[PDB]
Design an enzyme around this catalytic site. Structure first.
Site, PDB file in Angstrom:
ATOM      1  N   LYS A 115       0.783  -1.232   0.000  1.00 55.56           N
ATOM      2  CA  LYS A 115       0.000   0.000   0.000  1.00 55.56           C
ATOM      3  C   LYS A 115       0.819   1.288   0.000  1.00 55.56           C
ATOM      4  O   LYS A 115       0.364   2.310  -0.514  1.00 55.56           O
ATOM      5  CB  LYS A 115      -0.972   0.007   1.185  1.00 55.56           C
ATOM      6  CG  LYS A 115      -1.757  -1.284   1.353  1.00 55.56           C
ATOM      7  CD  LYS A 115      -2.968  -1.317   0.436  1.00 55.56           C
ATOM      8  CE  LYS A 115      -4.060  -2.216   0.994  1.00 55.56           C
ATOM      9  NZ  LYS A 115      -5.389  -1.909   0.399  1.00 55.56           N
ATOM     10  N   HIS A 158     -18.190  -5.706   6.390  1.00 60.34           N
ATOM     11  CA  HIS A 158     -17.220  -5.344   5.351  1.00 60.34           C
ATOM     12  C   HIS A 158     -17.448  -6.128   4.058  1.00 60.34           C
ATOM     13  O   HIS A 158     -16.514  -6.434   3.316  1.00 60.34           O
ATOM     14  CB  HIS A 158     -15.789  -5.581   5.843  1.00 60.34           C
ATOM     15  CG  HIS A 158     -15.457  -4.842   7.104  1.00 60.34           C
ATOM     16  ND1 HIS A 158     -15.288  -3.475   7.141  1.00 60.34           N
ATOM     17  CD2 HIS A 158     -15.261  -5.280   8.369  1.00 60.34           C
ATOM     18  CE1 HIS A 158     -15.004  -3.102   8.377  1.00 60.34           C
ATOM     19  NE2 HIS A 158     -14.981  -4.179   9.141  1.00 60.34           N
ATOM     20  N   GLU A 198     -10.391   3.328  -6.072  1.00 63.13           N
ATOM     21  CA  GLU A 198     -11.257   3.645  -4.951  1.00 63.13           C
ATOM     22  C   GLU A 198     -10.878   4.898  -4.175  1.00 63.13           C
ATOM     23  O   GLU A 198      -9.779   5.019  -3.632  1.00 63.13           O
ATOM     24  CB  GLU A 198     -11.337   2.451  -3.993  1.00 63.13           C
ATOM     25  CG  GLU A 198     -12.753   2.068  -3.595  1.00 63.13           C
ATOM     26  CD  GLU A 198     -12.792   0.879  -2.656  1.00 63.13           C
ATOM     27  OE1 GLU A 198     -13.883   0.567  -2.132  1.00 63.13           O
ATOM     28  OE2 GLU A 198     -11.732   0.255  -2.439  1.00 63.13           O
ATOM     29  N   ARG A 215      -8.185  -6.063 -11.049  1.00 70.24           N
ATOM     30  CA  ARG A 215      -8.859  -7.164 -11.715  1.00 70.24           C
ATOM     31  C   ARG A 215     -10.160  -6.649 -12.309  1.00 70.24           C
ATOM     32  O   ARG A 215     -10.677  -5.606 -11.900  1.00 70.24           O
ATOM     33  CB  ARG A 215      -9.146  -8.304 -10.746  1.00 70.24           C
ATOM     34  CG  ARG A 215     -10.110  -7.961  -9.622  1.00 70.24           C
ATOM     35  CD  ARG A 215     -10.318  -9.114  -8.708  1.00 70.24           C
ATOM     36  NE  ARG A 215     -11.296  -8.814  -7.674  1.00 70.24           N
ATOM     37  CZ  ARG A 215     -11.004  -8.259  -6.483  1.00 70.24           C
ATOM     38  NH1 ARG A 215      -9.761  -7.948  -6.190  1.00 70.24           N
ATOM     39  NH2 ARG A 215     -11.966  -8.027  -5.608  1.00 70.24           N
TER      40      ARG A 215
END
Lengths: 584, 126
Positions: A115, A158, A198, A215
């Protein structure tokens, strides 16, 4: 790509293969031992088994999937979602073997694992939160376009439960800004393929990047409805070396689309997945604006080795409020019998005053959790009339199909009219509504109508059965009020599926069908006792063994409870039909 | 409008209901004793009887149609054509009861009853 191997199962496997067939591309799938009779096995042109049911032995295996691709002479592999879709070593293995990986190159996958690495690469390129996802699509020639972002904020545990395609609550300037920012992000990491960037937003449109998915995702059909594109076709074209067929200035935005995900789960215990057979499966009516994607056929079982999802329902309408009405209208037509599902939750989730107003944020469901899981309500007397009528007509149907096999055809007695001579016939039946029993007195009228008195109130009940395809419907008229509901009767439970809800009425089971102390079989001596007082045995338990003229007889328990006294100790002589033990 | 009551019969009743189903709106109809087995009874999700076959006792009635709308929990009433479609008192009754009248407001209906009134209003507008 003339042949593609799809290393996946269920809804995603069928979604891709339908496009492939449309384009003329041959499809190969894999099915383990677990999916031998699943939907994607029959849709494929050819499929191979691999091994044991758990995914670790079938879909997550790197070597088995390549071995299938080589023997079938596949030119490309599509990983779909969830198994090898993020496996960078697999993408590198395909390259070395010579097979086209449909997705980003390994160089674009590996740098996204950490990340902090993607944060720096993209950064160098320029209270009630919401998750907003904007799509990026790039090719091997340096092009990229963006497709309009979704609102993915509604979730519990989630896991995404519903999704809104056009991301309501933003202005056109926000849509343009997210488009440019996501393309700069996708280029910063040299991304190729269909991916998603996102963003997280506050109430004042301060969007910040958090993560990027690498993906082709299962969420995409909800956006295709509003953009008018086909992303599966696009992904195959650029994998073959082509360019993006449609430029960023040609992407439109029309109407609103919603997805509702239907899981095999029981919300009453804070959603634990459940696995079992599906006895009845019916989908809402097909329509170009109502897209129905299922991975489960009627007669199939839900497994424990894989995702418990059953189906995804995607709808489109001209604006947001019309789509919410269509979503609920069609969702109530989706009927599952045989296991517990989350359909009632989805209906209460969409049909909520705050959700329709637009008060959507990541904590919506835990904020209003108590208002979404509601208790069972008692049936109306009219609903009990419908259940009683459906049962009576089902008994008639059995009578009619007996007659069709009879020699004595056209004869009287075959008409379930209840025609007594000079008097009327009243049938007293009891239906169980939840916990409580209700007695319904059904009088058979000369004209074929019924007069059903429930407690004191009499209803004039008429109706019949009719078929549409493979489903049976009950047509009712109760006191001049016409209605129509789907009638499914499974063992004891009467299911009525209407446009106002779903009601389950149970038929009580008589004692003599649900009942399924002991004596000595002959005059013998007892070898071994087993139990004493204070014990407890359950039915089918050894209480005693006795030998009578050299024949070992082990007594068993049809009864149940706790033994109060054992009358014969071991080594004593018991006689014929003498009581051995006792229950108090 | 999640549910509409169509206070009419036959071709017009079916024409509107097909659109409603297409949009996701539930449809209720009325059928008197005369239309018990007509086309719009089976197309509707629910329908109520009213009374004797002549239209004066079934489709032209103001109170019976409202009573059906209230018990079915209809949000709007569509009069279609020929019965209550020009009935200004019915549009005013719907407003007072709280039901959406699908059509012009009573203020636009009443002033059109007299041909000389609409002639002057429109002539003054060019």
């Amino acid at each position: 790509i003339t042949k593609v191997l799809i290393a996946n199962r269920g809804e995603i496997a069928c979604r891709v293969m339908r496009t492939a067939k449309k384009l003329g591309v041959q499809t190969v799938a894999v099915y383990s031992e677990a999916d031998r009779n699943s939907m994607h096995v029959d849709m494929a042109d050819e499929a191979y088994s691999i091994g044991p049911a758990p995914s670790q032995q079938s879909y997550l295996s790197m070597e088995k999937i390549i071995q299938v691709a080589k023997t079938s002479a596949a030119q490309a592999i599509h990983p779909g979602c969830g198994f090898l879709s993020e496996n960078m070593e697999f993408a590198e293995l395909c390259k070395q073997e010579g097979i086209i990986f449909i997705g980003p190159p390994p160089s674009a996958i590996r740098d996204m694992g950490i990340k902090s690495t993607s944060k720096s690469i993209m950064a160098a390129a320029g209270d009630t939160p919401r998750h907003v996802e904007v799509q990026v699509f790039g090719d091997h020639h340096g092009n990229a376009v963006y497709l309009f972002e979704r609102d993915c904020s509604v979730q519990r545990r989630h896991q995404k439960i519903i999704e809104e395609a056009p991301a309501p609550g933003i202005k056109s300037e926000v849509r343009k800004k997210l488009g440019e920012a996501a393309v700069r992000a996708a280029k910063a990491v040299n991304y190729v393929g269909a991916g998603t960037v996102e963003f997280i937003m506050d109430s004042k449109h301060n969007f910040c990047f958090m993560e990027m998915n690498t993906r082709l995702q299962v969420e995409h059909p909800v956006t295709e409805m509003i953009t008018g594109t086909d992303l599966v076709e696009w992904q195959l074209r650029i994998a073959a070396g082509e360019k993006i067929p449609l430029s960023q200035e040609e992407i439109t935005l029309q109407g609103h689309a919603f997805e509702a995900r239907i899981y095999a789960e029981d919300p009453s215990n804070n959603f634990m997945p459940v696995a079992g057979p599906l006895v009845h499966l019916s989908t809402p009516r097909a329509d170009p604006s109502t897209r129905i994607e299922t991975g489960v056929r009627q007669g199939d079982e839900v497994s424990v080795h894989y995702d418990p999802m059953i189906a995804k329902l995607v709808v489109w309408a001209a604006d947001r409020q019309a789509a919410l009405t269509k979503l609920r209208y069609s969702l109530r037509q989706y009927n599952i019998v045989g296991l517990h599902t989350n359909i009632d939750f989805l209906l209460n989730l969409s049909g909520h005053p705050e959700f329709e107003a637009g008060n959507v944020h990541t904590d919506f469901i835990p904020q209003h959790h108590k208002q979404l899981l509601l208790s069972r309500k008692a049936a109306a007397k009219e609903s009990l009339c419908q259940a009683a009528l459906g049962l009576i007509l089902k008994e008639k149907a059995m009578t009619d199909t007996f007659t069709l096999q009879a020699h004595d055809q056209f004869s009287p007695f075959s008409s379930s009219s209840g025609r007594r001579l000079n008097i009327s016939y009243t049938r007293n039946m009891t239906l169980k509504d939840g916990k409580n029993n209700v007695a319904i007195a059904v009088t058979y009228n000369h004209d074929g109508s019924y007069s059903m008195q429930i407690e004191d109130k009499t209803f004039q009940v008429l109706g019949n059965l009719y078929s549409e395809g493979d489903c049976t419907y009950l047509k009712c008229s109760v006191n001049g009020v016409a209605s129509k509901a789907k009638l499914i009767i499974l063992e004891n439970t009467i299911y009525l599926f209407s446009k106002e809800g779903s009601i389950e009425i149970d038929i009580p089971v008589p004692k003599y069908l649900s009942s399924v102390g002991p004596l000595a079989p002959m005059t013998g001596t007892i070898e071994k006792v087993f139990v004493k007082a204070g014990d407890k045995v359950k039915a089918g338990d050894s209480l005693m063994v006795m030998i009578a003229m050299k024949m070992e007889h082990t007594i068993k328990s049809p009864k149940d409870g706790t033994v109060k006294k054992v009358f014969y100790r071991e080594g004593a002589q018991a006689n014929r039909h003498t009581p051995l033990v006792e229950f108090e």
